[PDB]
Amino acid sequence: MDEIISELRELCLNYIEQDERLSRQKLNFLGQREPRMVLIEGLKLLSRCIEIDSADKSGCTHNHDDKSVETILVESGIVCPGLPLIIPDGYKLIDNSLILLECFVRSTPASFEKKFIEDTNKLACIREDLAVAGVTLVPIVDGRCDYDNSFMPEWANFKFRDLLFKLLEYSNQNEKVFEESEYFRLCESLMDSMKILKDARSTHNDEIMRMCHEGINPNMSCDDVVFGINSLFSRFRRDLESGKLKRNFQKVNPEGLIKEFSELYENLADSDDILTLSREAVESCPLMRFITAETHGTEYERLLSMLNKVKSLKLLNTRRRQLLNLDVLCLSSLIKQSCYSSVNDRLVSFHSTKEEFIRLLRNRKKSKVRASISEFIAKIQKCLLVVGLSFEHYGLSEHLEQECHIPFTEFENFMKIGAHPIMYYNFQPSTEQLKNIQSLRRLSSVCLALTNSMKTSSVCKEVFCQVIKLDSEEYHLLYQKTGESSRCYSIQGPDGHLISFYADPKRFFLPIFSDEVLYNMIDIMISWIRSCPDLKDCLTDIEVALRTLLLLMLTNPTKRNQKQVQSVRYLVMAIVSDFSSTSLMDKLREDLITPAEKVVYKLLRFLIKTIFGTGEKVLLSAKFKFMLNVSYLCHLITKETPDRLTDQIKCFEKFFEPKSQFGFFVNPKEAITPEEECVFYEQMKRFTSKEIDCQHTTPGVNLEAFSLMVSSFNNGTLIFYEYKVSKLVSRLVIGSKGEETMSAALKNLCFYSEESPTSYTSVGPDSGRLKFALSYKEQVGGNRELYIGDLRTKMFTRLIEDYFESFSSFFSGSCLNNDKEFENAILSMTINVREGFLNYSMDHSKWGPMMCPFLFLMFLQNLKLGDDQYVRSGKDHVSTLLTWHMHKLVEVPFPVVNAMMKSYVKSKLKETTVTERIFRQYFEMGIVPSHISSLIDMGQGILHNASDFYGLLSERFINYCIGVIFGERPEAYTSSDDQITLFDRRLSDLVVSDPEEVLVLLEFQSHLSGLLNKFISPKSVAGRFAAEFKSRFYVWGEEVPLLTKFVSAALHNVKCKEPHQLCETIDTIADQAIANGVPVSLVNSIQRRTLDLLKYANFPLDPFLLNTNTDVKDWLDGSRGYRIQRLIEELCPNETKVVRKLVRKLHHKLKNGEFNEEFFLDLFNRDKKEAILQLGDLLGLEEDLNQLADVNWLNLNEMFPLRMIPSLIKTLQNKLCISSGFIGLCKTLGSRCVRNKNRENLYIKKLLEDLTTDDHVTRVCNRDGITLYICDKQSHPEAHRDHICLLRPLLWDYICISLSNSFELGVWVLAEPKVNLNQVIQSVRRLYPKIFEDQLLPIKFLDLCVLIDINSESLSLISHVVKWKRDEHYTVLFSDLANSH
Amino acid sequence: LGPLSCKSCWQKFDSLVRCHDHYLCRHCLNLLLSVSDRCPLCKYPLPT
Ligand SMILES: [Mn+2]
Ligand SMILES: [Zn+2]
Ligand SMILES: [Zn+2]
């Protein structure tokens, strides 16, 4: 009883630190006896201990007296009336800032994250008030996963907490009982199916658990199911000749399909037939392709770099004028003693001024101040001020060059300088294909529309003239708006030539260097189709058409041009196929505007008539390959979502359409009101009442076939001015959308965690009701839905999505994440296709909104799995997390509701209203929607494993219905959205013997699926010759390569990172490509493009940047190590020749009985470069200092990484827009990025000029500058500034690699031309970095390889196989395996 | 051989002639042999 109290009394003053702030509470605690008082005092003490400890540790003075924020501001004498009332744990007041500290200790990760976000928002709310008050906030939180502190040792706090724990149960025995606040105290702060919660389930989990058993008969016999099936068919087939529809499934006549395609859009696209007409119309469609095919024909240009470099520091309209006199002056001492666009003296900012607004800004800015003497007061003072940004941050040599031009000015000369040069169609030659120069002009009219987001604010002749370089002669741009939005551009040449158009820069990155890769892609393709029947003059016609198509797609990129050319895969796979949905041609028709988007259609139809025309089925494999690749040609457009709001409205619409036709119940409450119960009554009643002739697309499952499925599984037979007003009147949402989204008050931040699971009803776990929120993902064709919820709900969902995963791991048909199953699926599909049996490559439609958690609940609470205490419970946790999901609450996104309210008020104050807008009208006549909750949800990707489980079993049942009726069991597969069905021989001889019966089979397999929730899409086929399981097509035998799928992916994703990693992503994606049939000569050109990008950023090309640009198909059997070693074995051709027999000797005498630790001593990393010399002397023969000292490459991250602790350590630590990334990588990598031995910052220019010019250093290039061909022993006035310390020898970095490459991939890597846990352990085998690599956790030669990997911090060779997944099966050409080294 | 149709008509159940690795018709063979010498499919010289 009181013994624990006495123990606490003797512990507090005798084992805890005695501080003044602690003493006040300690006396009160030890002086009280009543158990409730003892507990509250002890809790307060334990709270204040952590409070003061964390406050002192952060340096923030603790708020002992509970002073408010306004109190904190006023105690220093500052009056700030009006601020939210908060009590930070610690506070630091300085002259012009404020620091507020919040601390809290949580055990469960979920509540910890919730408290973290809550406190961050609470601190950030008053940011603007602090800013306008003249101060600023320093954000800081203290989230500690323990109660350790200065004032108490570990054992003291442990025993103290345990004593309060025991006293808490002792009090709980007495009348001190607390309902669930006791639970928060005791069980919180002291996964895998927490059953510790109570059970408040009553009179609602009886309706829900009753509808799942009313009507179903889940135990029918093994021959009362056959007699059930044979009375479900033949009650369909007898109602097919007059009743419902002819199966949606019709045979294919290829000519019929082609004519039906040709007759599409019988409005305006009307059969423009001849080629020459089509090309003549193409070469005039947009305004751009009307230039791209047109057949036309440094003292300055560096003063600008200086005048521009000192501009980012300041920006003012009173400036930028005398910043332009400095430039107009220079354009009077270079033509007078002798570009310029006619009114322009190109100013600093890519700006373009007029030579008459200058030379008139002065003479008022000057007359305001002896006019001739009035100059050289600002034309010299300005020079001195600009040179004031001198060697400050290394003001380079450009300072004395201008001291000659600028003072060379006068007023007898400045009264006519702009008065001297006072001079203020090309048609579409259409012969120009098979000509590089017509794409080699897009590749430079984009690089001058792309550089163009890289302008700045800069607040007629105000037009941001970029420059279009090209061979010699150059033409401009002219526009008026910067940033990344749209603007109306121009072009200028020597004549005017206003070729206006309207584009967006972000869409135009693909052709930025790529003139020899596109023109070779579209030249490989036409080497597939040297098909006989075409040898007549159609090959040139096809080539011109295909070229004029790629030009149109690149020049006029837009969403319609993507969806269109994407759809041409289904049509071709139907022309080669053998059955096809009747409603196909409504799945190809878009709406077309913008005559480019029509000529694309005309080209497509012409191409299809030409290839798939007469004489067909003589080479059909090659034409199929050609055309599927032309279908994938749609990746050349970027996937970057045209608009934001007009692509959020669309995703909400695609969510909310089916709910319109089923039921929705806007904005439920936290406690399910009777109306919600009534609406769920009605929906669960409609869901399970779908008669045997259904409306064929509506959600429902029929309780007469469903009974058969479940009862056949339980039984053992199936196993093994206007703007402002019109916006303020639409600012009424504030008047409508509320729809809202004693306890130890102080100690809430303390030990006691406020929110946590307790008694859980059937609706929600008592913390909330599984809230969510939706946003769109980004894809090529259409934007997929995405559901994202807070972390606690993301933790509950994992239990269901894991239980079902393991449960379906027992059954062997699904392939979603069972990767090993995919290989078997591929093997079986290939064996099938090789022979000619049908493949009903189906693809289900509306798999998101037509599946409901109610359905999995029905399917689970009816199965009869095994014994109790492990199965009888457990499933009573999935079957009560699913009930939670059934009542989820997605949230109508704020932009969408704002837009709908705006539209409503506009229309009402002042039709074509879509369905999901009339509902907004109904409700905004009353209350605005904010949350939608309905049965048919299956958040797309949330339960993407439960859905796979259900799909797998349903497909295992329907392929039994078909087996018992027709006589054959066809196997199947699944991914949770796609499928396949490989009918066997007996049902494939029938398609040639009788098609009218296999038509019924495909009519019925799509009718049962209707009687369940599975609706087959019109895009399915059944072909005796292709396949498409998860986008891996097949022809008879081999597989369609999809070249254009991988080229379009390598060319994108040049992400803003350190270039030594940007050039690692690409060296992965290139092996990804060569896995399939992208020929090697194209991969080289992709790599050359990437290097040209970097070289345009002005980044020195050190020999480890990007792989060899001379490759054998040797991307087999080589890691990233072999590419780089084969590079450095060609960059220094004959030095490498000894350092590759020294390594042979080293490997000879390291593996059996020598080295293994003393190699590390000779690795000598402790000191400087004579290790190569001593190691050559150790076991070899003459090796001069020439190999060692001479070859040396400049290395930017030699001492510290370059800004924006080894590598493999960071990677293991990592196991616990795209055209606005480049426009930034070209900005950081030019400024102060490299770092010195003292945390200093330099430029790459000041450092890359001295290493070649201002020393006895020889630096000539071989396409990549291997600077300082000597650095003789680095015997030198070393460490000049950095350019000598910062460059490491080459022929050593070759040794460590050409050894690491020799245990990892073989011994041949020297002759004359596994996983995370392991790596952590053999990093542990030297324990110095473990102090940093351990606390973040909450074989034969591997030691050598990991050791050589740690030092070489640029390069992979172990940390590769544990960072990027390689591939297993390669298909490679046979004209690349003959040219091998 | 393996399957039973022109590896290139993708049709024509059975009347074809044997290549080195696939089947080809009377036809099929004419319209290829009139353009080139190799079997553009099996990378071998066509039959005669
Ligand atoms: Mn599919
Ligand atoms: Zn044939
Ligand atoms: Zn052949």
Author numbering:
A (entry chain A): 1 to 190, 200 to 306, 315 to 355, 370 to 400, 411 to 465, 472 to 506, 524 to 784, 857 to 877, ...
B (entry chain B): 27 to 74
Sentences copied from the publication:
In the LCMV L–Z complex structure, L and Z form a heterodimer with a molar ratio of 1:1. The final model of the LCMV L–Z complex includes residues 1–1814 of L and residues 28–74 of Z. The Z protein was found to bind at the bottom of the interface between the core lobe of the PA-like domain and the palm subdomain of the RdRp core. The position of Z partially blocks the product exit tunnel for the releasing nascent RNA product. Although the full-length Z was used to generate the L–Z complex, only its zinc finger domain can be built in the complex structure, suggesting that its N-/C-terminal portions are flexible and do not participate in the interaction with L. The zinc finger domain of LCMV-Z contains a single α-helix and two β-strands and harbors two zinc ions by residues C32–C35–C51–C54 and C45–H48–C65–C68 to form two zinc fingers, which are conserved with that observed in LASV-Z. The LCMV L–Z interaction comprises a set of hydrophobic interactions, hydrogen bonds, and van de Waals interactions with a large intermolecular contact surface of ~780 Å2, which is 20% of the ~4,000 Å2 total area of the molecular face of Z. The interacting residues of Z are located on the surface at the side of the two zinc-binding sites, including P29, S34, C35, W36, Q37, C54, L57, L58, V61, P66 and L67. Compared with apo LCMV-L, the core lobe, head lobe, and clamp domain of the PA-like region have a 1.7° orientation shifting apart from the RdRp core with the binding site of Z as the fixed point. With the binding of Z, only one α-helix can be observed, and most parts of the α-ribbon motif lack interpretable cryo-EM density, suggesting that these parts have a flexible architecture. Moreover, an additional conformational change of an α-helix in the palm subdomain can be observed in the LCMV L–Z complex.
Lymphocytic choriomeningitis virus (LCMV) is the prototypic member of the Arenaviridae family and belongs to the Old World (OW) arenavirus together with Lassa virus (LASV), which are distinct from the New World (NW) arenavirus [e.g. Machupo virus (MACV) and Junin virus (JUNV)]. As a segmented negative-sense single-stranded RNA virus (sNSRV), arenavirus encodes a large polymerase (L) to form a ribonucleoprotein complex (RNP) together with the genomic-length RNA encapsidated by viral nucleoprotein (NP) and facilitate virus replication and transcription. Arenavirus also encodes a RING finger Z matrix protein as a regulator of RNA synthesis. Previous studies have shown that the arenavirus Z protein forms a species-specific complex with the L protein and inhibits RNA synthesis initiation by impairing the catalytic activity of the L protein, which is known to be essential for the balance of infection and further initiation of virion assembly; however, the mechanism remains unclear.
